Amino acid sequence: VHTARLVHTADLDSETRQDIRQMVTGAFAGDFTETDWEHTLGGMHALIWHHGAIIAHAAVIQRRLIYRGNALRCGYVEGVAVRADWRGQRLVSALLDAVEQVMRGAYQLGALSSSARARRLYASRGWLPWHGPTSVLAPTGPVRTPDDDGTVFVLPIDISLDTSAELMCDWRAGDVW
Amino acid sequence: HTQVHTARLVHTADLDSETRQDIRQMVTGAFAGDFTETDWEHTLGGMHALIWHHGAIIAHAAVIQRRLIYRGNALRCGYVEGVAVRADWRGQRLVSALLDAVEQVMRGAYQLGALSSSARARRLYASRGWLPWHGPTSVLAPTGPVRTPDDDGTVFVLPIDISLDTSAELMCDWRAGDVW
């Protein structure tokens, strides 16, 4: 059994920070860009090592998601990756056990964007698929992000959420979800 | 002999119920009761620098993650909230101990540190390298940008290896309550 360790970005020593960046970049099935790397920073990284090398990573960063006029405090998951030689060993579950613990202890909900493949994993853990329109609060005002519809999942922490409502994330460069 | 007290850094998620209550009670006292439900919410989500005495919290500061828009870019910011030292523990350089811990988190995780300062606190922040923001401040509210003129002249920034022109506009992201 593997258990993930939660390390804040600030506690990533240089060697470890570089190892995570390259592992995630080399494992992500999406096109993981420099801006996607930047989106993994600022919060808590769930890490698993094997004999000195990083083999699994998931970060949970803090942002706001606006739901019916309220800017909810969100733990957003980024950069979930397991090194190719370590897949099939339930490491993703271990990473999610760690970031969900952070959500329960610090946020009003967790949220993430899922690969269509991975949808079943998140649903099996209790995450709910968002059905309403997603959008981002851009500098010009709200902008709908339909390409992201159907990819967002939420893990409310003791709050109710009508998942058919709009969910508007806050702005950043690159992929907003 | 020199007496040195230092802060321990604890994530919100690792604060147990008793500690959350003690922090909230102490911060409330430090602000003479002016610490609202939303002010408390704003201290949650990130790292808290904590100093105790006899098991009671005597100093607190939080650094939470948010974005501040500068020159069209949403900078990754560590924003300081809830800086407080219990009134019987002043003059012992505990604010400096708190800021040593807060600034360590900023340097390791963010592009800049930011905060809104009381008039009396301006001197210590500047002395530590914090730069007063001179340009107009705004918030990216849900229907678009809104100027926050009452907050002009109160925001300080701690750039982390990026050079900032403090005469530019600075627009924080949205939240309930005090946006800055």
Swiss-Prot record, chain A:
<keyword id="KW-0012">Acyltransferase</keyword>
<comment type="function">
    <text>May catalyze the coenzyme A-dependent acetylation of the 2' hydroxyl or amino group of a broad spectrum of aminoglycosides and confer resistance to aminoglycosides. In vitro assays show no significant increase of resistance to aminoglycosides, possibly due to low expression in a heterologous system.</text>
</comment>
<keyword id="KW-0046">Antibiotic resistance</keyword>
<dbReference type="GO" id="GO:0047921">
    <property type="term" value="F:aminoglycoside 2'-N-acetyltransferase activity"/>
</dbReference>
<feature type="binding site">
    <location>
        <position position="31"/>
    </location>
    <ligand>
        <name>substrate</name>
    </ligand>
</feature>
<protein>
    <recommendedName>
        <fullName>Aminoglycoside 2'-N-acetyltransferase</fullName>
        <ecNumber>2.3.1.-</ecNumber>
    </recommendedName>
</protein>
<feature type="binding site">
    <location>
        <begin position="147"/>
        <end position="148"/>
    </location>
    <ligand>
        <name>substrate</name>
    </ligand>
</feature>
<dbReference type="Pfam" id="PF13527">
    <property type="entry name" value="Acetyltransf_9"/>
</dbReference>
<dbReference type="InterPro" id="IPR000182">
    <property type="entry name" value="GNAT_dom"/>
</dbReference>
<dbReference type="GO" id="GO:0046677">
    <property type="term" value="P:response to antibiotic"/>
</dbReference>
<comment type="subunit">
    <text>Homodimer.</text>
</comment>
<dbReference type="GO" id="GO:0005886">
    <property type="term" value="C:plasma membrane"/>
</dbReference>
<dbReference type="InterPro" id="IPR016181">
    <property type="entry name" value="Acyl_CoA_acyltransferase"/>
</dbReference>
<dbReference type="GO" id="GO:0034069">
    <property type="term" value="F:aminoglycoside N-acetyltransferase activity"/>
</dbReference>
<feature type="binding site">
    <location>
        <begin position="78"/>
        <end position="79"/>
    </location>
    <ligand>
        <name>substrate</name>
    </ligand>
</feature>
<comment type="similarity">
    <text>Belongs to the AAC(2')-I acetyltransferase family.</text>
</comment>
<feature type="binding site">
    <location>
        <begin position="80"/>
        <end position="82"/>
    </location>
    <ligand>
        <name>CoA</name>
    </ligand>
</feature>
<dbReference type="GO" id="GO:0030649">
    <property type="term" value="P:aminoglycoside antibiotic catabolic process"/>
</dbReference>
<keyword id="KW-0808">Transferase</keyword>
<feature type="binding site">
    <location>
        <begin position="87"/>
        <end position="92"/>
    </location>
    <ligand>
        <name>CoA</name>
    </ligand>
</feature>
<feature type="binding site">
    <location>
        <position position="113"/>
    </location>
    <ligand>
        <name>substrate</name>
    </ligand>
</feature>
<feature type="domain" description="N-acetyltransferase">
    <location>
        <begin position="7"/>
        <end position="158"/>
    </location>
</feature>
